[PDB]
Each structure stands twice: as structure tokens, then as C-alpha cells.
Amino acid sequence: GSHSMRYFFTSVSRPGRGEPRFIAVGYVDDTQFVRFDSDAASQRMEPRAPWIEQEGPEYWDGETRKVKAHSQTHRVDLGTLRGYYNQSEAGSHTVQRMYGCDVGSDWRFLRGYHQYAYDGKDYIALKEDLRSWTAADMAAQTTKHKWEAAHVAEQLRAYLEGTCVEWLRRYLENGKETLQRTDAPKTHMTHHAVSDHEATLRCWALSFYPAEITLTWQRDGEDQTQDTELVETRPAGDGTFQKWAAVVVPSGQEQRYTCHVQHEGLPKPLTLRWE
């Protein structure tokens, strides 16, 4: 029953090939609802969920204005960060920013976040009090001093505790059929010999939402963490997710092994067995 709204922004420099590529996406939980791509023809923030389509012209105009302003800031940032780190024009570099807010089952604010990364590593992040900064290295200390002097945290806190939470509530209401649903996983295990003496056991979960799920293997009740191959949870493309976990076991020992599935859609966690 808990929920989140998050916006993700990626800007990538391209040496001697024009302006940086900029992409923004926004999500409620594991459902995308808006996008912007600097390389696309429209130059507009665009809907990517049926329930956001009803927002009027002022919404789309305002969101487009904001996202273009983010794009321009990250364009400057790529230059600034090359200065901070004494880097040349020879290579491409990446800035990422993500921010948003979490609410619990009662839709009341839990926490807010705002994090920035340069070349795949933490650069600077707002702390949990929304009043102070964690800077990951010396160059990010420079940003921290500048952002402290400019009172950026107070502005972000007002957004995260106010606007973010208010609009997440509106979206949860307008997209209730999609967003406030829970699809329990449809589960099964498969068995395939990999030789005359071993078998792969694979535990499947299909057709679930939200994406959060735990799949684990036990052998006589003991967790087989180091021997389990667990794949990344993946989109089926219809709004649901899939995940599997596998172990390779000696043939004849299948009955010692159980797969265990936890999801918020299940009335109880499931244990699947070979007997």
C-alpha cells in the first residue's frame, strides 16, 4: 500500500557532435507516466500513461517549461564538472539527477530524496532531514558551498514535502485502476536435466505488480543464497513484471529443495515444492 513519485534525468555530452542528449522520465511506483527527449521532434513533455492524458494544456506547458529548464541547467553542469575535475573535450560524460517523495499506506509523507551523480558515481545528495547535503568528494564540496549559499535545500524541501506529495496523491486517485492495484504473482517451478546427474530448478513469478518481490531457494530449510542465480526483475511490457531464481542440484535431491515467494499481492508467502 505504500507509494512513491520519482523523476529521473540523464544528460550525456557528445564531443564534437552537438549539444548533450537529455532524457527525463517520471514514475509513480513502477509505472512511467511522462517523458521528454531532447533529440525528439516535439520538444514537449509527453504522456506515457493513460491516466495522465487528462491533464490540461497548462499542465503540459508547465511541465515542458520545467523540463527544458532542467535540460539547460544540466547542459551547463557538464561544462562545470569538466572544470572541477580537470577533464578534456576528448570524452563523453554523464550527469544524472533523481528526486521524489515516498508516502505510506495512509498517503502521508514518509521521506523525500534528491540525488545527483556524475559519471555513474554519487556526487551530491540531500540528507534525510532535507536541510543538509552529503557531498561525495572534493569537487562536490564546491557544489555544496554554492548550494548552501543559495539556499537550495529550503527550496527542495518545500517541493518534496508539499508539491511532490500533493501531485502524487492526485495521480494515485486519477490512475487508481492502474496504480492502486496489486497483481499477485502466478508462480511455478521448472525442472530440466543438465546431465545424467544434475538438474536446473528454476522458480518463476509472472504477471505481478508492483515490481518488489523476493524469491529464495532453501535446501532442507537452509537458504541457498550463494548457489542461487537470481535475475533482475523485468517488465513483461503490459504493466506487470517477471522474475526467476535458479539452482543446479544433484538429480534425486529435488525434494530437499523449496522455493519461497513473497509479494504484497499474496495473502500469505508461498512455498513451492517438488513433492
Partner: peptide, 10 residues
């Protein structure tokens, strides 16, 4: 809605 304030250059 995205942030309309607090997004400043590093």
C-alpha cells in the same frame, strides 16, 4: 509534477 524551484547549476 516536476520541481519548479531548487534545481540549480552545480
Amino acid at each position: 509534477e516536476a520541481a519548479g524551484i531548487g534545481i540549480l547549476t552545480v
